[PDB]
Design a protein around this nucleic acid. Sequence first.
RNA 1: ACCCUCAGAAGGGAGGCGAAAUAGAGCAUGAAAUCAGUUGGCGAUCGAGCGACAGGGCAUACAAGGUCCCUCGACGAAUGACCGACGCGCGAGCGUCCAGUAAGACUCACGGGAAGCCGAUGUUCUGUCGUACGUUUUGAAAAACGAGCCAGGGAGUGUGUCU
RNA 2: CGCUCUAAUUGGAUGGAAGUAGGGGUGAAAACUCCUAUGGACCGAUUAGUGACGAAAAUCCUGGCCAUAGUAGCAGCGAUA
RNA 3: UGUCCCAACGUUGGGCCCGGUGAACUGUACAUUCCAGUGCGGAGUCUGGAGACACCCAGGGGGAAGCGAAGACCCUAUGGA
Lengths: 150, 142, 49, 142
Amino acid sequence: GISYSVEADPDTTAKAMLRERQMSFKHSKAIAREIKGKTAGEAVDYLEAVIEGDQPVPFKQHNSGVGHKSKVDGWDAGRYPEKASKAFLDLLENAVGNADHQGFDGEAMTIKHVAAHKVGEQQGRKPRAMGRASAWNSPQVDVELILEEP
Amino acid sequence: TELQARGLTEKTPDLSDEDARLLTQRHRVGKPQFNRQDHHKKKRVSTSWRKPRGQLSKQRRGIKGKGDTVEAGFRSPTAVRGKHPSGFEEVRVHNVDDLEGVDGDTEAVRIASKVGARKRERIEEEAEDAGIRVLNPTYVEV
Amino acid sequence: YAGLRTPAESFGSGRGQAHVPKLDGRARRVPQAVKGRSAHPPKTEKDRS
Amino acid sequence: AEFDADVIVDARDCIMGRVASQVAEQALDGETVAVVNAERAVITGREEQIVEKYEKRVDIGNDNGYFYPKRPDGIFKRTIRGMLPHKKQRGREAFESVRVYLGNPYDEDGEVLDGTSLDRLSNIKFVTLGEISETLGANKTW
RNA sequence: ACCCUCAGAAGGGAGGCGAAAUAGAGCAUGAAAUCAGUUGGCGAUCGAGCGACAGGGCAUACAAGGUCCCUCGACGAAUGACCGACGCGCGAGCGUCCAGUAAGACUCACGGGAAGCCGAUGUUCUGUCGUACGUUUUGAAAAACGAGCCAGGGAGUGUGUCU
RNA sequence: CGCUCUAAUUGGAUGGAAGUAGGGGUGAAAACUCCUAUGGACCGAUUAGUGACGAAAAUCCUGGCCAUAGUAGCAGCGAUA
RNA sequence: UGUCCCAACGUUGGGCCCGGUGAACUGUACAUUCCAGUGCGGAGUCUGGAGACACCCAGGGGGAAGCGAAGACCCUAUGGA
Ligand SMILES: [Cl-]
Ligand SMILES: [Cl-]
Ligand SMILES: [Cl-]
Ligand SMILES: [Cl-]
Ligand SMILES: [Cl-]
Ligand SMILES: [Cl-]
Ligand SMILES: [Cl-]
Ligand SMILES: [Mg+2]
Ligand SMILES: [Mg+2]
Ligand SMILES: [Mg+2]
Ligand SMILES: [Mg+2]
Ligand SMILES: [Mg+2]
Ligand SMILES: [Mg+2]
Ligand SMILES: [Mg+2]
Ligand SMILES: [Mg+2]
Ligand SMILES: [Mg+2]
Ligand SMILES: [Mg+2]
Ligand SMILES: [Mg+2]
Ligand SMILES: [Mg+2]
Ligand code: NA
Ligand code: NA
Ligand code: NA
Ligand code: NA
Ligand code: NA
Ligand code: NA
Ligand code: NA
Ligand code: NA
Ligand code: NA
Ligand code: NA
Ligand code: NA
Ligand code: NA
Ligand code: NA
Ligand code: NA
Ligand code: NA
Ligand SMILES: [Sr+2]
Ligand SMILES: [Sr+2]
Ligand SMILES: [Sr+2]
Ligand SMILES: [Sr+2]
Ligand SMILES: [Sr+2]
Ligand SMILES: [Sr+2]
Ligand SMILES: [Sr+2]
Ligand SMILES: [Sr+2]
Ligand SMILES: [Sr+2]
Ligand SMILES: [Sr+2]
Ligand SMILES: [Sr+2]
Ligand SMILES: [Sr+2]
Ligand SMILES: [Sr+2]
């Protein structure tokens, strides 16, 4: 598992983490990238809109074959990874919760840092023609989130 | 309130005229990197020098641009070869007794990294009193 | 006999692999193979006096 | 759209290649040059074989492309480009600080460069850039 | 342990223990390949053995390197003048004298200056040269063969006899 | 030049050894050395020895890993649910 | 009698976009190429020119003497059956 890769002042900061989540690591880099800098509350509203299909998530690196989306600004390819988005909603729920329990205005805090890290693959095997089997794995993803007072 | 190195830190050795001339030359002429051929093209190939042995090797055949190949002609002047850039001849020291017989006007001392702080303190004060410069001194807040 | 207790055979040309003796899909016996024999090891018959 | 040229050359009755060579030399030396009256520049030889050459350049091509200019404007500008390392920084800079014009958009008159002049009273076998362009099918806008 | 969060004996947060939890369970150390985030340099008009050697930009906590730059002067190898005077050539130009003089790489001294400043390191730009490596071969950049990448593994050894 | 272990002689280490990472110095070079961080217990030098002693390559071996790619497949069969 | 002249329209399943799941082949390096030439005479990488703003989607497969298999042909071996 990871450790926070960035320093954080406990007096004006709140943290949260996801562990070994079996979801697209590629969708996670995309989502992290997109919500960094936003306010928790904005992030949440943004991710609810993605899951609802009203807001696409720019796919700038893992974009092969991805169709263009008119609402993607400054870029072309985008999608709606609702699974990894729900995992981030859990992360944000935990973060904002911690934030509040400490006396902060959770929803109003800025996402100072958010990054996904691939911690491994849950291994699987798939039978194929001609007597062989090939890999059929699940990515395991850790993601860190640091909220910071405005 | 600030850090200061122990010992004769700013000390310089006395060199004959011909030695200062050759020291200055070595420093002006320098030498090529002499890294192994194509070490930059493959991570599994380290920089450590290996004679290019390929029958068709471009560096072996001596093509301009493929880097210089190690030859005796690149050797530094005998009279200065191995001297610290300050001009001192280095003496490896593992304890106080190693300071004995060292000429602080011509040699500087280098305390092995493996030597502890307790013993380094003694070596350092005995070196200064013997007029010997310590190349890798301890910095104390004075 | 270390490294030699195996009937490992090479498949030869055909399956895009180097001609290395294999058993149960594992390379064996030869010196370049992990778990293979020692090419020129210490020998008991050597006169060390 | 205004071109502060340090030099204004008059190509009228001047050998194109000889002017081109000096304009390139000067552009590389950092001069901003404006070649004027390009349509009147001249090129020696049999009009028939000269034109056959430029027509071939017009017919050459394929998907990648071989866009050859037809106006005296570009013919001349291209002639100069072939004398400049236009793909290198210094070469592109020189090339871009040179411009060719149909007629003379300036108030000042250009100067005639030494050695580039052709005496019509002593020559009959020569052609005019304008004549070449018209043959190539250019729209005689000049 | 207790507390908060959560669908939750999960996970997360805060907290407790210990010299150390970046010793919290395949739990000493923790390389490379490589991944996330980020810092420096380059970057959407431009060309490909990825560099070597020179020289510029930008970047640089300390430590382990401390030099570097400009005026002038001294020394001054090979080489080596202008100008001027005189004399030749149809001409481009040349000879003789000035003169082996002025100059001349390195090194040193005086005076002044730099501390991202000199070295060095990262990256990039310019110049010159440059179509990997190993092997096969008369001839390899080769449209001949080998390797996806990294780490570790991986080939003159013993006895007897002879020289 | 470097690696392993043996012996003699002689040193270093919890006032921080080996290793690793980044960085400074030396050597034509093999490679040597220092600084800082990490690490938390072992490590050298000289001399004479010992040898399962040095890798870029063998469609070399084993392990790990990237691009491929969020791609192919998750349709086709007289049983379209 | 749509085999053909000479093709058209339609049906079902794919293809395309979205959620989820999620491989493999292949990879010396670099790589935006084109026309000529050169070169072990069959070059994206050498030379000269030409062209060339970056990225992405769909496509049919011209080229990489494409990938797959240490040529089953031919010869050679004081080889095998
Ligand atoms: Cl992934
Ligand atoms: Cl020598
Ligand atoms: Cl064309
Ligand atoms: Cl060019
Ligand atoms: Cl004429
Ligand atoms: Cl000198
Ligand atoms: Cl041998
Ligand atoms: Mg697609
Ligand atoms: Mg079967
Ligand atoms: Mg390398
Ligand atoms: Mg074994
Ligand atoms: Mg561990
Ligand atoms: Mg080799
Ligand atoms: Mg001894
Ligand atoms: Mg090894
Ligand atoms: Mg594809
Ligand atoms: Mg064969
Ligand atoms: Mg036959
Ligand atoms: Mg037979
Ligand atoms: Na991309
Ligand atoms: Na858009
Ligand atoms: Na848009
Ligand atoms: Na066995
Ligand atoms: Na024996
Ligand atoms: Na002509
Ligand atoms: Na054309
Ligand atoms: Na630089
Ligand atoms: Na070969
Ligand atoms: Na070769
Ligand atoms: Na070839
Ligand atoms: Na592979
Ligand atoms: Na293979
Ligand atoms: Na039909
Ligand atoms: Na094709
Ligand atoms: Sr991409
Ligand atoms: Sr130490
Ligand atoms: Sr065969
Ligand atoms: Sr000229
Ligand atoms: Sr804690
Ligand atoms: Sr002189
Ligand atoms: Sr290896
Ligand atoms: Sr070995
Ligand atoms: Sr993969
Ligand atoms: Sr179905
Ligand atoms: Sr089917
Ligand atoms: Sr070219
Ligand atoms: Sr297709």
